[PDB]
């Protein structure tokens, strides 16, 4: 909840992006320059933090350079009005480490949109349109709110292959309805 004597504490209440304490970073959303790491947490009066992400062998101060996936951290460093690090009551350096996974939705929402398109055409049946897109719907509905694990990613992706497959042509529809 909040690391005894930190000026920083995680907001909790951005469930697109922090889980169980945990944070989650969808890089479709980096991209389109909707993540800042600053408004994942809540800091006290009188201090600033600067984000730091570490991944493989690297740091990185711009979250507009994460570009691949997978597990990471994401710490805030904590500052007085000297521009100094806090240094808390107990003696230690007052920073705020986060567990992180990072994930990009990009592909499964490409995958989405050309499914909706093709599903769209007049040829396939209105009912089978209307069940495949009731089920790319509930994936998008769920991508848009809840972070994922990119192997959560590429489940949905298999998913909605497999939801392509429920249309019917029209034409296939109206000869097993005949009659000998």
Request: net charge negative; hydrophobic share 35%.
């Amino acid at each position: 909840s909040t690391i005894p004597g930190s000026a920083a504490t995680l907001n909790t209440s951005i469930t697109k992006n922090i889980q169980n304490g945990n944070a989650y970073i969808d890089l479709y959303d980096v991209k389109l320059g909707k993540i800042d790491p600053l408004q994942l947490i809540v800091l006290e009066q009188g201090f600033t933090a600067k984000y730091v992400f570490r991944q493989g062998t690297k740091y990185y101060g711009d979250v507009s350079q994460l570009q691949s996936t997978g597990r990471a951290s994401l710490t805030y460093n904590i500052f007085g009005e000297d521009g100094l690090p806090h240094v808390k009551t107990d003696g230690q350096i007052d920073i705020v480490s986060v567990a992180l996974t990072i994930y990009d939705s990009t592909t499964l929402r490409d995958k989405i949109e050309e499914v909706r398109t093709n599903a769209n055409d007049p040829k396939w049946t209105e009912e089978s349109r209307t069940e495949v897109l009731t089920g790319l719907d509930t994936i998008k509905t769920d991508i848009d709110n809840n972070p994922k694990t990119q192997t959560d990613i590429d489940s949905k992706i298999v998913e909605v292959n497999e939801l392509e497959k429920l249309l019917v042509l029209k034409l296939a529809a109206a000869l097993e309805h005949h009659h000998h």
